[PDB]
């Protein structure tokens, strides 16, 4: 229908933020997506400056008061390749790209105001790179993906999926390079920050619970970190989203436990609005958060009132298409509880066409945060089950290290279980499967090898190939697959949807953005070719000028459009 | 933006539209209605339609007047046209009977006398000439290459072949022990047929840049011109027969056409016609009665010659506004031909306006003073539509419509590119896109490989990629259809074939294929996708699932048309 369009589309140009930090002495960094695209904005207390002309898809995380932004944009049409401009934010809409970083893949960075300090991958290794005044230099060469989280006087901190899906700490010096690991033997760093004392200040989340350790980068000794207030360990996180040191010396915690987090200031419980909270950045002496949760839009609030500076207001009419919402905890093959965000239409009966939206990652979470297709969803009158499949961060360490060496193996069951509960709890009165990513994959390989669960699925920007993928991969997804596969070509091959295709018996609906350079389109004109082959049903979207980060409106209407029209016409079978 | 397209074209597409098949369960109209989403067949007794089919259909057999029963027409094969008759008894609306004798095939055409159902229809060995009567199924004739039944009195069949070099020959075939004979003119093609009660076929036959009905005697071939006793005919100076048959009073009805507007003659008098193109005509409770269509008016039926309307869907006051009017123009081509174009003007778009060059498939087609849904939808989305007959077109002479033959990717694509150029160049033009399907989708591939630049973007529905492979993956008629069109030349199919000239693509390219489309394959279309990504080109494209080359379903044409208006609407918002 034309008016699923129109839900859609306004889902979809609802404004949606996040925050970035403070720059231009006393203002607000945002990224909005907003007015048709993601851009860069100043707010301070009033209307927003853009910084930027042409959509961007992020910028480095600044130093408090910086007086300009590095914006990272796409230059590739989609494929990531990304070049820097900068921006200086006394003068909005003034670009200067940054010409001594050859286009990459730019994964992060923090800009100091004085060196520009990032990671990327080219084809042939992910690396740290430092930019001032003498020019690039490449501080070291990361094992794979690596991120910088802060910068303090000559150290460099930051995290690294460097083996096993754990993640390490790792250091660098700005002035001189080099690179050290921290490895932790009981999980993952999930969040730095260099103390004052010139100590990295970590989330480190272990099998159950996450804590606070300080890391001393001179030994690797490891400590735990004790606050002034017990708020926060008595929070008991599973997870620690973000920390970060305040200008007046406080340490910022977002963690979280089931989907939801919590703010906490030295220690202290900061009220916030329900949902799940980004980085706290103090501004004008407050505190200000983004906030987002299943019915409400990244927005920038205030703490502690939940004042919102900067919100894209959902629609009441949106908004009430999703009835209800619970976290039902599916019981999966081997007795793994799935936490599982489920939303009710209210535009649909009970039982009623139900969709499990897989999420992507794998290192992801539904949570109590804004899905802008499981909105769609639920406007479209679809129940929508969101399973955190074994993988799934959020829900601590041993959960997630669950599906290293196994894709297509346990975390699928746990999407078939939750399938199985959406039905047997009553919910469902047909299934669907619909994913994005790793959420594609697991549609297709569900639809492979599960043939008769669900009545159609939807795989968007899906794997197909992981051997394939592998060879068209970059340094860091190259590395990324090999830890996920375990190595395997076995694996890599076996757990391919593509060598599985005449097992499909259900309708298929692909999306793909044609210049994705993570799940590249080439496996998927194969997929087809073996569907056309095998006589197989299929449909396919092949979306122009774009890759797997949508920074459109347009694009993001391309790529979800297509996924909610063929879930509304096998609706009418 | 695209809600109201999306409101725009499902409203153009489920619109009803109406074509009249005949006269059967006695005195009642046979009519084959898109209506209620889909192509159904419904009798008309001038109250309310009759059903007689259940699930959709492609289309129905030409009923001798009067017989109590409907052959339907429909793929079985989702979408692949491997198509199964259905008989339905007119007194038993809804009860199908499949015809098992009848083994899947694509159904080119067919005639039901009664006593037996006549049909041609093509398999992977052959274009054959079948008769189905109550001793079974007989195959009377393998033909050349396409043939369709046009007529059937007693024993003699009469129909049309495209055998060879793009010309029509007649044919004739005995009902009761098959055999074959052509019949072919050195001065044109045969375009209509009927016999005449005098067992003689009269035959439309349509030269270099003229048409006129000629008799011809089956026996021994003897070509004599017929002669009606009213000259309104002649002097019309047709240079097209869409149609004739004999009434059953022994009246000869003809629908003949110039410059994209057809004219309706009873024993050559003319007889008054809404403004437009008409189809058979059949005599109902005394009156004449046709189909008519306009580029403003959907397939409708009507009495003549009163212009009232029988069976007419009514459009939406908002949609017939967005249609500000439509022109013929002749645009001078490479050689100074010139190119009967029609043109609709947007009441949505500004002068100099967005303006696509809708390419007609076939080849042998044509952009006439017709309905045209794909049109009216890019009239609706603020697009003027400039719709050239390319050499290749039927409507404007023989030789014309030959002159494609041997040259496909060649004069027919220059003449397009003259169009469009002379969209720009009138003024009517601020930016060009092309977009067509089937024959015309591979004019869009053909056009941005060999005329980088001349359109801003492109959309190519259903479109020939590659004459090579597609002739591998083709059946016994299209097979022969492609040799013809190529003239036999593999130099032809391979340097004519877009897929080979990907490198020269600068401009977006939006692809639509229904993937079970046995006329124009996917298979060589997920190989240009290959290419279009190896070579960095911008692309976008849209695969229908479980459908083919003929949409009979509301939904299945919002599948095809719908993606192709978005990606022009979001290239205009473009530079």
Request: with cysteine; hydrophobic share 40%; proline share 5%.
């Amino acid at each position: 229908f034309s008016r699923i369009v129109r839900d859609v589309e306004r889902l979809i140009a609802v404004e949606k933020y996040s925050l970035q930090g403070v720059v231009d002495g006393d203002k607000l960094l945002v990224v909005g997506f907003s007015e048709g695209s993601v851009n860069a904005y100043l707010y301070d207390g009033g209307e927003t400056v853009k910084l930027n002309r042409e959509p961007i898809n992020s910028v480095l995380d600044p130093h408090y008061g910086v007086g300009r932004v590095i914006l990272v944009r796409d230059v590739s049409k989609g494929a990531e390749q990304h070049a820097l401009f900068k921006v200086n934010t006394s003068r909005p809409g003034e670009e200067q790209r940054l010409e001594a970083v050859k286009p990459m893949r730019i994964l992060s960075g923090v800009d100091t105001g004085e060196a520009v300090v990032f990671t990327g991958a080219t084809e042939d290794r992910v690396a740290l790179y430092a930019l001032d005044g003498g020019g690039l230099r490449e501080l070291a060469r990361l094992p794979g993906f690596g991120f910088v989280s802060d910068i303090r006087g000559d150290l460099i901190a930051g995290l690294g999926f460097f083996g096993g899906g754990r993640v390490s700490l790792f250091t660098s010096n700005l002035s001189s390079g080099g690179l050290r690991v921290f490895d932790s033997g009981e999980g993952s760093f999930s969040s730095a920050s260099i103390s004052p004392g010139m100590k990295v200040t970590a989330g480190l989340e272990t099998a159950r619970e996450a804590r606070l350790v300080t890391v001393d980068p001179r030994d690797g000794s490891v400590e735990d970190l004790e606050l002034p207030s017990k708020d926060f360990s008595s929070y008991r996180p599973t997870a620690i989203t973000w920390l970060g040191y305040l200008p007046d010396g406080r340490l910022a915690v977002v963690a979280r436990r089931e989907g939801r987090s919590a703010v906490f200031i030295d220690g202290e419980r900061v009220e916030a609005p329900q949902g799940n909270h980004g980085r706290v950045v103090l501004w004008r002496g407050k505190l200000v958060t983004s906030h987002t949760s299943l019915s409400t839009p990244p927005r920038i609030v205030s703490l502690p009132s939940g004042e919102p500076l900067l919100e894209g207001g959902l629609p009441e009419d949106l908004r009430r298409s999703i009835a209800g919402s619970r976290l039902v905890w599916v019981e999966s093959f081997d007795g793994s509880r799935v936490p599982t965000y489920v939303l009710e239409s209210g535009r649909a009966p009970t039982p009623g066409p139900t969709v499990v939206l897989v999420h992507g990652g794998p290192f992801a979470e539904d949570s109590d945060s804004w899905d802008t297709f499981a909105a769609s969803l639920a406007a479209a009158g679809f129940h929508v089950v969101m399973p955190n499949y074994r993988g799934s961060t959020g829900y601590g360490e041993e959960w997630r290290l669950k599906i290293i060496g196994d894709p297509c193996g346990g975390e699928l069951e746990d999407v078939s279980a939750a399938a199985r509960w959406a039905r047997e709890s009553g919910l469902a009165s047909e299934l669907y499967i619909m994913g994005y990513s790793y959420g594609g994959y697991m549609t297709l390989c569900a639809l492979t090898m599960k043939p008769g669960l669900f009545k159609a699925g939807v795989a968007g920007a899906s794997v197909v190939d992981w051997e394939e993928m592998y060879e068209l991969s970059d340094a860091a997804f190259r590395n990324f697959i090999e830890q996920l596969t375990g190595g395997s070509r076995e694996i890599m091959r076996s757990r391919s949807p593509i060598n599985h295709v005449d097992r499909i018996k259900e309708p298929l609906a692909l999306i793909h953005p044609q210049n994705d350079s993570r799940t590249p389109l080439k496996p998927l004109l194969r997929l087809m070719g073996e569907l056309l082959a095998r006589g197989k049903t299929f449909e396919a979207h092949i979306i122009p000028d774009a890759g797997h980060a949508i920074n459109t409106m347009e694009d993001a209407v391309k790529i979800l459009l297509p996924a909610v029209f063929f879930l509304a016409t096998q609706r009418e079978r």
